[PDB]
Amino acid sequence: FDRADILYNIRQTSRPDVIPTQRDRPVAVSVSLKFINILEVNEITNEVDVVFWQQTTWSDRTLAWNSSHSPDQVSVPISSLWVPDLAAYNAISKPEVLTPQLARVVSDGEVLYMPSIRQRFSCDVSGVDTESGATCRIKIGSWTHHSREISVDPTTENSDDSEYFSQYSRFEILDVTQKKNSVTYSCCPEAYEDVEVSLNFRKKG
Amino acid sequence: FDRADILYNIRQTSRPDVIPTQRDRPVAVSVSLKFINILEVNEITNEVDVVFWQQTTWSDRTLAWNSSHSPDQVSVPISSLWVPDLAAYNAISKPEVLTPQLARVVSDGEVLYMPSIRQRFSCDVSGVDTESGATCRIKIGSWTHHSREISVDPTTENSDDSEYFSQYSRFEILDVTQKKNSVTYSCCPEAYEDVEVSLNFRKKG
Amino acid sequence: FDRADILYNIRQTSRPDVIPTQRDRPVAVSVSLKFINILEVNEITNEVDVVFWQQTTWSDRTLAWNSSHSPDQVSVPISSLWVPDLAAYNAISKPEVLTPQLARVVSDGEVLYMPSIRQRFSCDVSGVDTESGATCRIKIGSWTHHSREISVDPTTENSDDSEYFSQYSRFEILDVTQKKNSVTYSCCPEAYEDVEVSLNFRKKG
Amino acid sequence: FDRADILYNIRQTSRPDVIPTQRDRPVAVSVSLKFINILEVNEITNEVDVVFWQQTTWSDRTLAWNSSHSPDQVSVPISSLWVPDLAAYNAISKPEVLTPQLARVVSDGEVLYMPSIRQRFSCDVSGVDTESGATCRIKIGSWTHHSREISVDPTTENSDDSEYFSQYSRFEILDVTQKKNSVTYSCCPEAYEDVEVSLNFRKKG
Amino acid sequence: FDRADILYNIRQTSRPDVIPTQRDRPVAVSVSLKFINILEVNEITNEVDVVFWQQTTWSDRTLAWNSSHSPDQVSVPISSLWVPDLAAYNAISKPEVLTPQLARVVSDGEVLYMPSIRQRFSCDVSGVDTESGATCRIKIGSWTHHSREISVDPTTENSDDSEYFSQYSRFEILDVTQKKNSVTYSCCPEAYEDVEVSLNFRKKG
Ligand SMILES: [Ca+2]
Ligand SMILES: [Ca+2]
Ligand SMILES: [Ca+2]
Ligand SMILES: [Ca+2]
Ligand SMILES: [Ca+2]
Ligand SMILES: [Ca+2]
Ligand SMILES: [Ca+2]
Ligand SMILES: [Ca+2]
């Protein structure tokens, strides 16, 4: 089994429009933002222009294949796989994906998609130029799937919150924390899980 | 009918170019804007840059299926369904859809599409920085279908007009009301229904 | 015959790349701009940012269908029909079509396409802030078809020149007139008809 | 052989990805810019924002057909024909094609494509506000095909250099000249022909 | 076989989604940036707006043919070939490809793709207006493929670092050097090679 045979199968059998749900069991999607840069801040308008890696992970067993005597991983175009319909609730602009829209698929059906995104948000900027700085919270979760179909969860809290952050940034990061939530909206019957990421940063002293 | 079978049928049988009309009966489309944010205001030019959820709903019985022994709802791509050719009459820019273009389809043929849109409009801004504030009216309705084919109607007046509004917005909402209309234009023979939404807001005093 | 059957036929038999010409007879296309708004003016640079309805009409008999028992009209996507390759000669930016790109087709082969366009032009702005105001002329005609294939003609001079104009516009319209032309260019052998629309407006006083 | 039949053949037999080369003989492509307007100039940054007609012409005999009793020319979409991969070497932005992307095809296989393009360039602006003015040179030629496959050549020097120029332009044209070249680059083995157009203009006085 | 037969084969047999890997052997991709221009600099924000040729080269033997009596090179659209999923790690905007997205393929399976790109970056701008100037480093490597699949390497150090640079640029180039790297990220298990290009330039005097 070669990469050609592997990609060819996934391409020929995959269905991007169908969520890899197993029974009433929701699809476990883990989200993790890794800030790469903070470009524009406006404390007057409370708007931020930031860059980050939307490190996403989930499992699709219909993509699994035996790799004992074959490659364990392959790069698959996002368009040939089903992908979480995630959305940043307080995004003020659409995502400007800066990187190739390819995902990584492991023979066991594990999918890893980590695109670099530049996007504007509406959040609390007050305190940016302070020692305690500002705390901009960004909430992102499925747009059409509720908790019974899709569930989002945070990840790796170890990793230095700014090991990927640009050093030439006009700003600096104090701390980053992610706490998942589960909300029921008057608009909508069922509950919608989402990961809230709090970006505590400040202008470089 | 697993989710794959459901989506597969809709995809294979649907016709996005055909309005789900039953007899001389128009398609009942309900529109409801939920303001999420007001980004830029210019009282001199009377131009607004706002974000909102264009909560739309209508019914397409050709999408209905028996859900007695399967899911009741599925997420369908907008491109696989017929969608109302709505247009904001005083929109100054085209809609910047910020969210995944997926709709939600209920087994009974009910369709719910609620994209988050950022868009500019030409309306009355005078009074923005006033206690009574300004009242910006936005009218949206079908562009090519008259009242006999498509009819638009407002919805849920209860819901707090700003329960989804951003708190970090430079502005605040006093009140929001929607009143449907029915106009005949010299340009055009038949009548064209539309929902007029009045946004009474003001700068934070 | 119901809309599905109608749209289905047009879709299956139409050819967007073929001009509906009958013999050496040109296709009679009528153009009519209805100004909706004037957004930015610069008398120094003679540039205008305006919004208007490019009300276009022509006839394609290959789309005609018997309707003694069926609607005589349907909404057809622009991509499934042949459309006039019109261009605004003094357009400084490309057309930002603000509305659904659907056309209206009458059972007799009559086609009506009226998109709302925002676009910048290079024209005479001098006099904008004057009682007599400025006169910005915009010329639009087929880009590749000469008078023997396509002929453009103005229309309805009655209709109040500003019955669709925005009232919140920083400017106001004095008068609008359209006079068709027929030019032969040294560059090009045959003659190219075009409609010249003169927009006499001024800053509201 | 009406037009539908003509377009239908070209569409069904054409191959946009294949250069109409005859033997080791290159394809003779003639390029000719006709300036329509000069919109923004910055002598400090040496950047120009200009509009022009990229009048292009070449020959593709596989498109030829018997015009004995059938139309001689037809309008063909650019996407159904092979087109020169021209590029403006000092273009600072990509081409904003302002007109329908249709080409004109003559029964003998002659192809004429003249789109109106707005684009920014990096060139010599110094002297713009002078009697002798500035001379902005723009070089454009095939990006991937060398002299043995594609050869570019200038054209009609008669035509008044500003018979299509906008009169409301903040600037004026003194003279326009085009001189073809043939360069071999260290980067690249073979030689690459290109047409250099010198735009001598100045701010009006 | 003619140009047509060659392109036709590549088109009919190629697979853009499959990396041309031979055994556990990685694909050797060589990257080389040739700066064409530096458009905007901001020492305060450490952001650069630059234009360059992302001269890329690699080998895909499945594209090789017998040119022993046929043309040896052809221009192939990027969409019909597999292409390295390269990404500029500190790119602040996505690539604005200014040129035709065509690659050059040699009968031996060698592929050469050199698009002209305008793009913004986050790097060290301090010193721009200095004799020693600033050194802006840009790192680019595969986004999804590690060193075992894709390996990147610099190239030709001879070529005058500014023989393609614009002379009208507000800035000038002192020196350009490229040194490949190999990094293992806590985020990611395997190692990811990348080419680091250091642009030492300064404002003119
Ligand atoms: Ca194989
Ligand atoms: Ca942390
Ligand atoms: Ca099943
Ligand atoms: Ca209310
Ligand atoms: Ca009139
Ligand atoms: Ca000349
Ligand atoms: Ca052949
Ligand atoms: Ca060097």
Swiss-Prot record, chains A, B, C, D, E:
GO molecular function: extracellular ligand-gated monoatomic ion channel activity; transmembrane signaling receptor activity
PTM comment text: N-glycosylated.
Reported tissue expression: Expressed by glial cells.
Top-rank taxon, per record: Eukaryota
CDD domains in the record: LGIC_AChBP
Positions of glycan attachment: N66
GO terms for cellular component: membrane; synapse; synaptic cleft
Alphabetized Gene3D superfamilies for the sequence: Neurotransmitter-gated ion-channel ligand-binding domain (2.70.170.10)
Subcellular location: Synaptic cleft
Sequence ranges assigned to domain Ig-like in this UniProt record: 95-198
Family: To the extracellular portion of ligand-gated ionic channels family.
Function in brief: Binds to acetylcholine. Modulates neuronal synaptic transmission.
Name assigned to this protein: Acetylcholine-binding protein
Protein source organism: Lymnaea stagnalis
